[PDB]
Design a protein around this ligand. Structure first.
Ligand code: 3R0
Length: 297
């Protein structure tokens, strides 16, 4: 195997300023902040995720995976700060996760945006495949929005070399995880987008899922989906993992479709819709602010 020559950046507490809290849960808490490196004259908008020996192992495992990735459609680790707590420093994805974005903005989400997101997720996913990485937790909650036109896959820590309703049948029954099992999760993610954030198999308990899938039952055709789009979702949900599409085929399929979006997704009021663009008023003291994607070293 090839040596992982990735750089792990240790960042000083004094190098960054926590602005506020974005959310809390069963891990610690995610903060919004600014990273002002050395005497660089730059302000990088960051997301800071944050004592027991067991919990530090898990967060450092995610740091390992996250520092080993470099792709426009994957979230890379900027660095770690070795405080008493130990925290990951990541790029601020100002618009939050895709799941909540589609729920909050359904009325302005057109076919072009939906299909483009599908292309972007397949591209990120294909990159993880090139890097021999199996996500093991791909879902719309784990896809973040930098801008409405640019999304990235995040949330490693399950990534190697339980979310039942996003899992391939082999993963539920035999704990087998492959790039082809990530394809099943991809199908579910697409379904989450096409339904503007509906919960998969709503009301059905996780213990019933395995047996439901075994019978031949799958997530239903979302109203906006043409048989063309639903056919791709269904192919991701085949029993034979090798029968499922490959992420490189998903990029191709969705790209062809993103060239004529209205032929593949039927949305009342399509094209008349508009989401915030980096060419809009007050889209962004913020003098020397540089996005992490433009801060290289
Ligand atoms: C408890 O739920 C919270 C999670 C953070 N959320 C959020 N709102 C706005 C921007 C943003 N930016 C952001 C979040 C990130 N979360 C990750 C991440 C978390 N675990 N693994 C990766 N990377 C990130 C990069 N930017 N996040 C609000 C709800």
């Amino acid at each position: 195997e090839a040596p992982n020559q990735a750089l792990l950046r240790i960042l000083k507490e004094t190098e960054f300023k926590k602005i506020k809290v974005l959310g809390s849960g069963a891990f610690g808490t995610v903060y919004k902040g600014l990273w002002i490196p050395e005497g660089e004259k730059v302000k990088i908008p960051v997301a800071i995720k944050e004592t027991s020996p067991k919990a530090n192992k898990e967060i450092l495992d995610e740091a390992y995976v996250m520092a080993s990735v470099d792709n426009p459609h994957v979230c890379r680790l900027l660095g770690i700060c070795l405080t008493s707590t130990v925290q990951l420093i990541m790029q601020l994805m100002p618009f939050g996760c895709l799941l909540d974005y589609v729920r909050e903005h359904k009325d302005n989400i057109g076919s072009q945006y939906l299909l483009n997101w599908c292309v972007q997720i397949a591209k990120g996913m294909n990159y993880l495949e090139d890097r021999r990485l199996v996500h093991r937790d791909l879902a719309a909650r784990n896809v973040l929005v930098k801008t409405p036109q640019h999304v990235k896959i995040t949330d490693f820590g399950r990534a190697k070399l339980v979310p039942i309703k996003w899992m391939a049948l082999e993963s539920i029954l035999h704990r087998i995880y492959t790039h082809q099992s990530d394809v099943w999760s991809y199908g579910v993610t697409v379904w989450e987008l096409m339904t503007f954030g509906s919960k998969p198999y709503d009301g059905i308990p996780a213990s019933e899922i395995s047996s439901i899938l075994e019978k031949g039952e799958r997530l239903p055709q979302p109203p906006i989906c043409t048989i063309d789009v639903y056919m791709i979702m269904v192919k991701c949900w085949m029993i034979d993992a090798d029968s499922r599409p490959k992420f490189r085929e998903l990029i191709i399929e969705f790209s062809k479709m993103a060239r004529d979006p209205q032929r593949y997704l039927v949305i009342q009021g399509d094209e008349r819709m508009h989401l915030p663009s980096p060419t809009d008023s007050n889209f962004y003291d913020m003098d020397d602010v540089v996005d992490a994607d433009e801060y290289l070293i």
